[PDB]
Symmetry: D2
């Protein structure tokens, strides 16, 4: 029927997300006021948050995107992933802001962060809509965080279950029958 028919509970409402994005955007705009950073999202989950975040960030910036895929074993050990789409511009000397939907193990993100430092970024910071710090497999701290969630079992606003639900305007938890 309707997608709400699959949602057990709304954890973060659209109104709550909108207020947070407004707040974070104002903070990021002030922190990068005299340097046009490169704001980068990792496909696909970061897309909705990145779009609304940046639209509330009143400062000059450039957008870009990466796509990556798992190598399997090395990905779940060091976070190394295969670059499917690299950035359209060089990193050297740039201030990089990685926009993410959620950080859990933090392995792939940590790999990307240190890749950008290898590429001589002037700086690298991270903004994430959701953080689950109890999931860390590496010490990786986001610089800007929307909400801290006790678990990563949620859908909406970029987050998927079998590639669906990313288009929900809120963050929720699925009913058990959907996945089991």
């Amino acid at each position: 029927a309707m997608m709400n028919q699959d949602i057990e509970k709304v954890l973060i409402s659209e109104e709550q997300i909108q207020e947070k994005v407004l707040e974070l955007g104002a903070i990021i705009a002030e922190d990068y006021k005299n340097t046009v950073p490169l704001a980068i999202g990792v496909l696909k989950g970061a897309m909705p948050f990145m779009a609304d975040l940046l639209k509330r960030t009143d400062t000059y910036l450039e957008m870009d995107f990466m796509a990556v895929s798992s190598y399997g074993h090395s990905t779940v050990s060091t976070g190394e992933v295969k670059i499917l789409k690299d950035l359209d511009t060089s990193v050297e000397g740039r201030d990089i802001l990685i926009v993410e939907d959620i950080i859990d193990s933090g392995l792939t993100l940590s790999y990307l962060v240190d890749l950008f430092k290898y590429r001589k970024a002037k700086s690298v910071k991270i903004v994430t809509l959701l953080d689950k710090p109890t999931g860390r497999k590496v010490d990786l701290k986001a610089d800007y965080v929307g909400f801290t969630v006790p678990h990563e079992f949620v859908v909406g606003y970029g987050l998927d279950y079998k590639e669906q639900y990313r288009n929900l305007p809120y963050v929720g938890v699925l009913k058990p029958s959907v996945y089991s």
Copy 2:
């Protein structure tokens, strides 16, 4: 020292874009009620509109993205472009909805539509925020359109000038001094 100071005039306000996105999403949700389409955005310019449109599209769908680059002359004459990032899933038998920020010549978008048909898509439809039909170099009509514009000399809500301004939450016209 800030962006709005580079804008001569707002052509479509943020409020007009939100109302339009709301309307378009309700139409698209109805049209695709039965089957879960694959909604595709071509990076980078389609991202903000795609995020906000799909958030307002209350139906089951899958999101995906493509990245392409110019080959030079064939791109300008046939629309043929290099695929830098192909879809994550196969096209055969799927209903495809391409989400675009603006259609002008329509050459590349047409190359992509007919590629998806070569790949045996069940159907291919297009939703664009902006359309400039006077600019066409191929017969390509969008199925869903936000606003009809004159000229592609506009920035904001995905549209850039030298990679900047895409993060404005409205569509505007730059002051002549910005681009000389």
Copy 3:
């Protein structure tokens, strides 16, 4: 984590027999190069190899093709369902130049089901190639899952578990200078 034991093992010990020797491959490559050079007298084709298996053959063939031409490469990967039925694959690396108006020569190590290659040929036709032809070192036409005849063929094979000269078994043996059949013990 990973420990490797090769001891004094040599690849030839894994080979039951040499099916197509280096000498045989080189004589056929020389003939094919002369025929292609004559056929493409009037054009400069875009010769494309699909990574990884086509590489050794493509290098030797083109070195024996005395005519102007350009080289390019593609990389693709399976979608897991439409790949087995339609040949549709994900493009991981597209060509570095446009196909429009070019005479395309696809260089392959082996054609078996032919599904992916059939997909690529008609993609290049959609992209307005002036012509598309295929040269394959080996052909296993009994494996076909679609109607696809290569324009130039080195050898007909039927065998299972063939390796060498770009053909692999679990990513090994591509660097052999001949085409061999593996001992059954190697793959049990």
Copy 4:
């Protein structure tokens, strides 16, 4: 006559019907027979050096393909092949080596012995970027084999572990090396006539 265009950002190429490559070459610098003898030697050295491990031998497209094919077929040891493709980010690639990855390795680098196979090294900037990318990815070791070397042309410190031939002041094409995408398919390394390139 015949013509075509290629990228880039476009060039138009016009050929007379009886134009032949060889006549574009002033002299053969390194003959096919010299190359065969060198690959045989290097292949044997490489097989001995990598007797204890299954290396990942990686070619950077497009130029490295012919040498890589011939060298590896003379390298009688267990190994895996892979390929990368890269693009320039413009003037910044020219000064730092940083390039856009268009095709990454099909397998992970962590813990692997990587052997990069190149056609020529001159400034060394891009290769150096790739070597240290693999070290960032925790390669067990990274070594380089190049057919041709111009070591006084370096803009970064990078010594190739294995080198076929050192090239002097000559504009070379063939055996993977191009001029405007032509000549890669010559079975030798030739000195291109000044008239061809100005």
